[PDB]
Design a binder for this molecule. Structure first.
Ligand SMILES: COc1ccc2nc(C)c(O[C@@H]3C[C@H]4C(=O)N[C@]5(C(=O)NS(=O)(=O)C6(C)CC6)C[C@H]5/C=C\CCCCC[C@H](NC(=O)OCC5(C(F)(F)F)CC5)C(=O)N4C3)nc2c1
Ligand SMILES: [Zn+2]
Length: 199
């Protein structure tokens, strides 16, 4: 309406969780200054690698996971925002507030996880600190931590994957179930729900 109205920035990839070796570890690929500038321009010329990205807006940081050629994350992190890319902002390909789910085309250079068809309930949650947390699946969209810990340790990991023993994607971490600040269970978007959304 006004000549003063501002536009929200793009989501920016600022790092990744490295899962390629024997040791999981977080890597930062962009610092806060370049992140702020890239959010405004939407132009990110940095090379993207791997499956799990660390992403940030001006106000939040969380994770994003490539499965089947789509970079997925949570709506409560990304809203309807574009993601920065070498050629400018990229509009979401999937948006579903009812699932807390959004998706963009996976970045050039990323690797995608394969959707799990194992039917296994022994899962592993990957956090933004590269902790690999055993989680027993307890329903279509819930799992229990085998070793509970304060919600602090899970904050910022929405958008991260739950994996099966074979390293396939089983879901996208959405929310934590807490008792007196201790995370006992997690909610996630099952990969079948992503596979449906893709149709
Ligand atoms: C606006 O449009 C939408 C549409 C759909 C939608 N859907 C949601 C389920 C939702 O929930 C909110 C965000 C999420 C969260 O914090 N997500 C992280 C995370 O890390 N975020 S993040 O990266 O820090 C951040 C904020 C940058 C992006 C993984 C958590 C980690 C720690 C928990 C912190 C305390 C919070 C504990 C809380 N618990 C819970 O609500 O339980 C409910 C429930 C459940 F089953 F769990 F769903 C019925 C029992 C929780 O987890 N919330 C609250 N907001 C929305 C909003
Ligand atoms: Zn599997």
């Amino acid at each position: 309406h006004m000549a003063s109205m501002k536009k929200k920035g793009s989501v920016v990839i600022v790092g990744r969780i490295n899962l390629s070796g024997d040791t999981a570890y977080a890597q930062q690929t962009r610092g806060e200054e370049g992140c702020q500038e890239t959010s405004q321009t939407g132009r990110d010329k940095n090379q993207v690698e791997g499956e799990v990205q660390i992403v940030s807006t001006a106000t939040q940081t969380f994770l994003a996971t490539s499965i089947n050629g789509v970079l997925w994350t949570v709506y409560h992190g990304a809203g309807t925002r574009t993601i920065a890319s070498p050629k400018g902002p990229v509009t979401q390909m999937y948006t579903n507030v009812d699932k807390d789910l959004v998706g963009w085309q996976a970045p050039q250079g990323s690797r995608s996880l394969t959707p799990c068809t194992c039917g296994s309930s022994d899962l592993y949650l990957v956090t933004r600190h590269a902790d690999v947390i055993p989680v027993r699946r307890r329903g279509d969209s819930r799992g229990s931590l085998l070793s509970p810990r304060p919600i602090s340790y899970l904050k910022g990991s929405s958008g991260g994957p739950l994996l099966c023993p074979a390293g396939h994607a089983v879901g996208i971490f959405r929310a934590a179930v807490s008792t007196r600040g201790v995370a006992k269970a997690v909610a996630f978007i099952p990969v079948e729900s992503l596979e449906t959304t893709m149709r």
